[PDB]
Write a protein that binds this ligand. Structure first.
Ligand SMILES: CCCCCCCCCCC(CCCCCCCCCC)(CO[C@@H]1O[C@H](CO)[C@@H](O[C@H]2O[C@H](CO)[C@@H](O)[C@H](O)[C@H]2O)[C@H](O)[C@H]1O)CO[C@@H]1O[C@H](CO)[C@@H](O[C@H]2O[C@H](CO)[C@@H](O)[C@H](O)[C@H]2O)[C@H](O)[C@H]1O
Lengths: 1030, 200, 100, 100, 100, 50
């Protein structure tokens, strides 16, 4: 194949040319985004039952939907929450690989079947099903800088003006507005209503009566009377629109002729549909959108296109309305494409230098400069074909591939160059000679490296998706690099290189190059002596080898394991929890005393604070609030003291003095989509109707037990804790003794306290909703219900206090279920320096002390790691078996393969050394980096051994062959190490956007490249001789 | 349409809509009604059963479920005053007329509003003149569209959309197809002369 | 409802949700004065039509709660849209015994 | 290069597929009273005045290809095979040029 | 409900919508004294069971509104399963303490 | 899916009441296991015969 393209450099040019075109055509159809789909696809089912309690939501909505949620493909688990603000969520979770469009349709179809089983009132709301991955592109924010507009107004605007166009912006996917359209509100006054012996129920019935589009037929329809000739549609009235029209829908008329209009009993004005959730941007009323990137879009282009669309609207926006962009992921994505295109270029630059320095020839220097980009472009085509995207992980994949790319080119050129020098052959003859030498071994090493990198691709779950990125981008490059090292570069060598006088090693040139060639000529001879020495006094060295090994192992069991590096995204969370009882107003201050603090004292690090009342990440309701702390670009806040990690510590301490409101600050997880990165996640679950109270004892036993366990720490329930609630007792004996129905009682309490969505009116074109409930000051305290009356048999208003009575009791503000049964989620993590595996072991034993009828199941990353943890050993064992079997075939030997495999430790020790020595962890980037480093190392070993076996076979002694081989291979080895370490250095010392990953990748390869280069050049001949001798 | 009829190259031009049409704006009240007549909206039903044939339930017919419609007699829904015939119930048992709260006038409303990429719009078909192609017509139509009140744009669709694509493709088609010929000859003949000869 | 209601309360809402659908070429709706509407979403060749339909159903379901209650309880028809008839199979009465 | 710019552009060459469409659309407001007469005339002034090409002529009032409504009708103009129609004045392009 | 009631209030209302379903081979059904019913829409070999199910339900949800409330409230099941039972898992009392 | 079922119920036995055992009345899978196990048996006999 090589001998074929040496004589056919045009064909070879053509292949390279089509690889380039394909790859270039591919780089611009390729999706561009932060991450691929890490989280297991999931589908949220949501609705809010106005006025309703967590119990009524769970037992009227969630239970009935859950009962019908089955016979659905690829379902892993189902989990739900019912909340005290009347909202619920059922999340269905599927296997990775599930098509989300299929998953969605499957879940909404079974929803649809369950819809008639739900209460009439929830059916009327809707029930929205959506894809629930939390991988948002940016989040906007329409905030009123003055105070002209409320959160409700801002919303209506976003949905009136911002939304339709934002949805037509190129690359915009799914998005959440923080609020809906206006609702026509009607606030019933209990006294102004008692005075006309009227009830809320009369108002609803009335509103329904005088706000209803009447069909109204056709004027000349079919059939018709013979003739006519003129047919026309007759348009009746459509529904009411203004507050004033609503204020006028008459209720009753007195015997004196005087009429009662709605206005005589309540106020009326456009308002919020739900007021559970409240949010401000640095203090001012605010709403906003959270946007996702569409399938196949370009993360960068769409962020521009969003800002574009928005700006074309800023002109018309009311006075005081400011759009604003607190969170945007594009900076990191962009700072990753450049910080890779840079390192790529540098690497090809650096290869030029070390290529020149050593080979002292511009023609030779061009070969690597052609081939490396050819292969870079190829890889992108290959990614396109296989359905991958341009993302954080696929790009870092390219950075690790550089060593292997750079090497393939250097080995081929340097070897032609050497062959010409030693034997005085001509370029063509040298090139064919050289590819007779290498070639087999290159095919050999393409196999061996596939065996090393592909198994990662067959990991399961979320961690599997991550590794699969690195795996596929690396083997594609490697594979392409080998192909090119067999077609193009030996053709380029034959063509572009000039001859070299036999025996000419440049020791005469004088100048720097004259010094260098004598220096390196001596270094070489020095090295042959070292090696020659080692091959006499073997034992002491095999001895130190064993010490190196034991050192590696020891070191593994000493480095902290972790999932991904500790990135500084420009963001920090603060969860607020005021006491059970607390109103939103209270919580709202707790979150202001934070904003004022962050925004001023921490002006050095903090840009803006987005605060919320009613929403939190463990829960919802008035005692639950939160701050989304933004931070100014990495650039404008250098030094450890302004790291998110440091700001947190400060923020913690400050908030810690709040013996009035639990407050926590924490950097978000490496990958938001997944949440909680280290730790464990599980649900305790009532698998036999034991009941809430029992279930509560289990969760509390679990907690006050796990806390005596020195294998865990930070073990907290995820949900909320039971809070006081005011039960209503109604004595039906006194109700019916006073002539008052019972259904009229319930309608009074729903339609005044809870609220009641009655009708659809029309606001400025679109259809919006009419809500009916009691005016706020009528429903604040227990005495306020004694303010409400109901009509009897006759027309005697009977106050609620004449048949009703209160009583304080406990109940759940947030009910949870996992797989259809009641449950309670528990977080926490392993004790410092222990593995989540250990933690699960402790936990697996605690569980056995739970009450009878309570089980548990792992969820989330704990569920996943439980299955993926089992496969690693198997895959790593295949990897070893196949690398062995290829080496066997390559060397025609069951024993020689051992002389290359035993380099594995040699490089891994310097990695463990550097990374441990610099305080980083055994995470994904280190793991993949480690396989790269051992790849390159084994490639170096393979060739040394290959040449040695050739030399041994043409009739030289084993030690003689080992020394010659080593001498032949030292130059290529030093060149590629020289070029690759320096290429990486920038990653190893970077700062800002993406620096945490860049360090986790640089630190390990430098380390592993140093120890692997300096040690294998001495130990591989040892092993080769050591094993041949047996 | 005017300029379309004028313009030499165009033929059979037409709209897909229907201008506007006469609509009988049955605007009624509640004040003059709810006095001596109907509580709430007892009439809201009366209106959408006589004129607007109301569906009530099924019935089996020779083996098959079919519908049961209930519409007022043909002669009782023909003309504007013909509706005053329809009497409603009075709360106190009596029979209130329809003209006691009727009011019905002519209004002009659209019989078929169209939208296209989320903006209101009107589709208009048309052929090219005899012995001109669709392209010529297109070329023409893109002129008789310039005299339009700035505010109103245009956009091709169907057959046309398909045309405008096919033209755009052609360049790259020719480029690439030239390339692939060039390269494959250059590989199979180990030269640059041959493939350069055949390009010429 | 008038074509103008059918448009302001239905069509316009459903069109909002159809933006963002994979492989969309264009969308064209009509509102009629008889209470009927049709939204037509058209896709590039090579788009799998069973999957376009599903995607259409996925987005529509989000509009649905924003529709008038008189529609939500109704039941929206979603189908693959062929512009051309293949044939008409007619029926005609010879002896005049049967009317239309 | 000059010759290239001279050639006019089409997409598909017009074809004669033994079929043509009547598109009747009486001024709106009318009824099947007028519409039906407007249709039954052009059905005849076509089935009799033009039976060389034309074969059957299935007619309809209500649902043309534009709207619904009583002020709408159409027809499916079926034709006789290709053998049974000599060139030029029997092509649909001609059969509809003067039918128009 | 009688078989006759379930056939004409439920089974036939659905059947009249079961069309415009791709690769539809045949439809069958049963209506019974115990109130139950089944419509089985069988498809051509090679059909994607996910799409078949989506199409049936798409048509079924047009009938659903015309079904009696007491039938909607009971809760309809659409399934994509094989005709034979795979197995049956039973439970039986040890102490004889539990009834059927 | 039979194996999957055995496992769903096995995960639920610990919470079952007292006077209660799970049983498997009808069951189609064993024919399948039996079928292939029995051919594997004749697979080996042939490889030995030859
Ligand atoms: C910076 C890093 C990236 C984060 C980007 C920010 C995240 C966006 C948060 C969006 C967000 C708050 C918005 C409020 C402002 C927050 C400020 C944000 C500013 C950011 C700078 C929208 O919240 C929704 O807003 C709706 C607005 O209408 C509201 O609708 C209401 O009124 C309407 C009126 O008519 C009315 O019609 C309607 O009926 C009403 O219901 C909903 O009730 C409310 O839930 C929260 O949504 C909730 O998210 C939960 C957790 O994700 C998620 O829980 C599930 O998934 C978890 C997944 O892990 C999982 O673990 C949980 O167990 C699981 O339960 C919920 O399913 C989801 O609901």
């Amino acid at each position: 194949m090589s001998k074929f393209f040496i004589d056919r450099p045009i064909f070879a040019w053509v292949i390279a040319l089509v690889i380039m075109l394909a790859g270039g055509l591919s780089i611009l159809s390729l999706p561009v985004n932060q991450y691929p789909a890490i989280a297991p696809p999931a589908i949220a089912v949501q609705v809010s039952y106005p006025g309703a309690s967590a119990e009524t939501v769970q037992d009227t909505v969630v239970q009935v939907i859950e009962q019908q949620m089955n016979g659905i493909d690829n379902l892993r688990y189902i989990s739900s929450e019912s909340n005290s603000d009347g909202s619920m969520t059922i999340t269905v979770t599927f296997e990775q690989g599930t098509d989300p469009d299929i998953a969605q349709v499957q879940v909404q179809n079974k929803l649809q079947l369950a819809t008639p089983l739900l209460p009439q009132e929830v059916q009327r709301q809707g029930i929205r099903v959506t894809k629930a991955v939390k991988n948002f592109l940016m989040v906007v924010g329409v905030v009123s800088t003055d105070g002209s507009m409320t959160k409700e107004d801002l919303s209506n605007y976003i949905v009136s003006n911002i939304q339709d166009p934002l949805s037509r912006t190129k690359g915009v996917g799914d998005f959440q507005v923080f609020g809906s359209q206006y609702s026509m509100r009607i606030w019933l006054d209990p006294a102004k209503l008692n005075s006309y012996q009227l009830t809320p129920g009369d108002v609803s019935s009335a509103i329904q009566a005088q706000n209803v589009q009447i069909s109204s037929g056709q004027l000349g329809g079919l059939p018709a009377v013979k003739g006519q000739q003129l047919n026309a549609t007759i348009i009746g009235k459509t529904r009411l629109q203004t507050a004033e029209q609503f204020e006028n829908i008459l209720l009753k008329v007195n015997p004196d002729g005087s009429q009662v209009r709605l206005k005589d009993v309540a106020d009326v004005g456009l308002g919020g549909q739900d007021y559970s959730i409240n949010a401000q941007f640095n203090g001012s009323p605010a709403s906003g959108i959270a946007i996702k990137l569409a399938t196949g879009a370009n993360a960068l282009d769409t962020a521009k296109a969003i800002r574009q669309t928005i700006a074309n609207l800023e002109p018309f926006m009311p006075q005081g309305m400011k759009v604003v962009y607190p969170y945007d992921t594009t900076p990191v994505v962009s700072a990753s494409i450049h910080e890779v295109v840079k390192t790529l270029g540098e690497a090809i630059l650096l290869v030029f230098l070390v290529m020149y320095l050593f080979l002292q020839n511009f023609r030779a220097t061009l070969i690597p400069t052609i081939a490396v980009p050819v292969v870079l472009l190829g890889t992108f085509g290959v990614l396109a074909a296989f359905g991958f995207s341009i993302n954080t992980l696929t790009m870092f994949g390219m950075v690790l591939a550089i060593g292997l790319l750079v090497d393939d080119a250097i080995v081929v050129v340097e070897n032609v160059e050497r062959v010409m020098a030693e034997e005085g052959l001509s370029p063509r003859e040298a090139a064919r000679k050289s590819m007779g030498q290498i070639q087999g071994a290159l095919v050999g090493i393409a196999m061996v490296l596939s065996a090393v990198f592909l198994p990662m691709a067959f990991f399961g779950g979320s961690t599997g998706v991550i590794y699969r990125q690195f795996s596929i981008t690396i083997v594609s490059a490697m594979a392409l690099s080998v192909i090119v090292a067999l077609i193009l570069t030996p053709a380029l060598c034959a063509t572009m290189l000039k001859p070299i006088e036999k025996g000419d090693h440049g020791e005469h040139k004088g100048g720097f190059f004259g010094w260098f060639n004598r220096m390196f000529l001596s270094t070489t001879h020095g090295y042959e002596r070292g090696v020659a020495s080692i091959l006499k006094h073997r034992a002491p060295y095999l001895l130190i080898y064993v010490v190196i090994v034991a050192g590696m192992i020891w070191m593994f069991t000493r480095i902290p394991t972790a999932f991904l590096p500790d990135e500084d995204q420009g963001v920090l969370f603060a969860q607020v929890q005021t006491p059970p009882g607390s109103s939103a107003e209270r919580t709202q201050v707790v979150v202001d005393s934070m904003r004022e603090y962050l925004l001023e004292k921490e002006s050095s690090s903090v840009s803006s604070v987005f605060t919320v009342t009613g929403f939190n990440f463990a829960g919802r309701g008035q005692s639950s609030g939160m701050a989304f702390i933004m931070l100014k670009p990495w650039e404008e806040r250098p030094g450890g003291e302004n790291s998110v990690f440091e700001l947190a510590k400060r923020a913690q301490m400050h908030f810690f003095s709040f013996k009035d409101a639990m407050v926590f600050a924490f950097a978000p997880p490496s990958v938001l989509e997944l949440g909680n990165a280290t730790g464990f996640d599980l649900f305790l679950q009532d698998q036999a109707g034991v009941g809430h109270e029992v279930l509560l004892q289990a969760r509390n036993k679990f907690l006050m037990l796990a806390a005596q366990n020195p294998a865990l720490q930070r073990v907290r329930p995820n949900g909320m804790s039971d809070e006081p609630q005011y039960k209503l007792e109604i004595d039906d004996e006194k109700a019916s003794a006073l002539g008052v129905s019972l259904a009229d009682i319930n309608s009074t309490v729903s339609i005044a306290w809870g609220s009641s969505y009655v009708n659809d009116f029309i606001d400025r074109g679109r259809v919006k909703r009419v809500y009916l409930q009691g005016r706020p000051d009528a429903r604040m305290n227990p005495d306020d219900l004694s303010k409400w009356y109901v009509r009897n048999d006759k027309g005697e208003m009977v106050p609620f206090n004449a048949f009703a009575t209160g009583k304080w009791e406990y109940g759940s503000p947030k009910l949870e279920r996992y797989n259809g049964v009641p449950a309670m989620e528990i977080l926490g993590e392993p004790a410092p320096g222990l593995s989540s595996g250990d933690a699960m072991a402790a936990v697996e034993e605690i569980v056995k002390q739970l009450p009878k009828g309570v089980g548990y199941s792992w969820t989330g990353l704990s569920y996943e790691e439980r299955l993926s943890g089992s496969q690693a050993p198997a895959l790593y064992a295949l990897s070893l078996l196949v690398v062995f079997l290829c080496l066997a075939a390559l060397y025609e030997s069951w024993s020689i393969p051992f002389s290359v495999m035993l380099v594995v430790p040699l490089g891994v020790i310097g990695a463990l050394l550097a990374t441990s020595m610099r305080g980083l962890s055994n995470d994904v980037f280190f793991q993949v980096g480690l396989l790269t480093t051992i790849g390159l190392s084994a490639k170096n070993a393979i060739l040394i051994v290959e040449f040695a076996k050739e030399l041994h076979e043409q009739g030289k002694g084993i030690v003689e062959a080992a020394i010659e081989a080593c001498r032949m291979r030292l130059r290529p080895i030093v060149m590629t190490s020289l070029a690759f370490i320096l290429g990486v250095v920038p990653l190893a010392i970077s700062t800002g956007a993406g620096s945490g990953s860049q360090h986790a990748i640089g630190t390990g390869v430098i380390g592993g490249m140093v120890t692997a280069t300096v040690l294998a050049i001495f130990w591989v001949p040892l092993f080769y001789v050591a094993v041949s001798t047996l």
